[PDB]
Design a protein around this motif. Sequence first.
Motif, mmCIF file in Angstrom:
data_model
loop_
_atom_site.group_PDB
_atom_site.id
_atom_site.type_symbol
_atom_site.label_atom_id
_atom_site.label_comp_id
_atom_site.label_asym_id
_atom_site.label_seq_id
_atom_site.Cartn_x
_atom_site.Cartn_y
_atom_site.Cartn_z
ATOM 1 N N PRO A 13 33.551 35.651 42.274
ATOM 2 C CA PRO A 13 34.263 36.935 41.285
ATOM 3 C C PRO A 13 33.805 38.173 41.405
ATOM 4 N N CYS A 14 34.067 39.134 40.760
ATOM 5 C CA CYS A 14 33.464 40.529 40.755
ATOM 6 C C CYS A 14 33.869 41.217 39.232
ATOM 7 N N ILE A 15 34.876 41.632 39.062
ATOM 8 C CA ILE A 15 35.284 42.472 37.898
ATOM 9 C C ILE A 15 36.809 42.202 37.385
ATOM 10 N N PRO A 16 36.727 42.318 35.906
ATOM 11 C CA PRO A 16 38.179 41.762 35.563
ATOM 12 C C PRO A 16 39.238 43.103 35.427
ATOM 13 N N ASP A 17 38.714 44.094 35.708
ATOM 14 C CA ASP A 17 39.430 45.350 35.386
ATOM 15 C C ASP A 17 40.541 45.524 36.420
ATOM 16 N N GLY A 18 40.607 44.867 37.645
ATOM 17 C CA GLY A 18 41.642 45.122 38.795
ATOM 18 C C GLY A 18 41.296 46.175 39.588
ATOM 19 N N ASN A 19 40.569 46.929 39.288
ATOM 20 C CA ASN A 19 40.239 48.106 40.447
ATOM 21 C C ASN A 19 39.252 47.636 41.362
ATOM 22 N N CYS A 20 39.938 46.802 42.202
ATOM 23 C CA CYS A 20 39.334 46.274 43.389
ATOM 24 C C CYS A 20 38.609 47.154 44.375
ATOM 25 N N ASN A 21 39.528 47.787 45.128
ATOM 26 C CA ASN A 21 39.070 48.517 46.173
ATOM 27 C C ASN A 21 38.196 49.785 45.879
ATOM 28 N N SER A 32 37.115 46.603 53.379
ATOM 29 C CA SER A 32 38.197 46.604 52.519
ATOM 30 C C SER A 32 38.194 46.822 50.996
ATOM 31 N N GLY A 33 36.848 46.360 50.713
ATOM 32 C CA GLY A 33 36.718 46.937 49.441
ATOM 33 C C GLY A 33 37.190 46.193 48.221
ATOM 34 N N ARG A 34 37.968 45.323 48.430
ATOM 35 C CA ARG A 34 38.991 44.729 47.445
ATOM 36 C C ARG A 34 38.187 43.849 46.388
ATOM 37 N N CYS A 35 37.416 44.439 45.310
ATOM 38 C CA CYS A 35 36.614 43.645 44.198
ATOM 39 C C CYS A 35 37.382 43.326 42.869
ATOM 40 N N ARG A 36 37.661 42.091 42.615
ATOM 41 C CA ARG A 36 38.074 41.654 41.271
ATOM 42 C C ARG A 36 37.444 40.310 40.863
ATOM 43 N N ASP A 37 37.767 39.989 39.463
ATOM 44 C CA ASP A 37 37.221 38.628 39.210
ATOM 45 C C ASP A 37 38.476 37.908 38.437
ATOM 46 N N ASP A 38 39.071 38.433 37.143
ATOM 47 C CA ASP A 38 40.201 38.218 36.704
ATOM 48 C C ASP A 38 41.395 38.217 37.650
ATOM 49 N N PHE A 39 41.133 39.209 38.405
ATOM 50 C CA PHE A 39 42.117 39.423 39.506
ATOM 51 C C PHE A 39 41.518 39.251 41.124
ATOM 52 N N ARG A 40 42.345 39.172 42.005
ATOM 53 C CA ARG A 40 41.920 38.584 43.201
ATOM 54 C C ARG A 40 42.150 39.803 44.328
#
Length: 47
Positions: A13-21, A32-40
């Motif tokens: 996982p990573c972060i639940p805010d959805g601001n992955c990149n 690619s920097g695509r980081c989320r937790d709740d989101f993928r």
Amino acid sequence: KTCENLSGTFKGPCIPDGNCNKHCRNNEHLLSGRCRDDFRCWCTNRC
């Protein structure tokens, strides 16, 4: 591409805010920097 995994439900996982990149790209400056937790999102970098 380089070492990439999807951050979220599967394979770490990573972060639940959805601001992955912006996450992997701002703090770690990945490829690619695509980081989320709740989101993928897929973060890519050289492992």
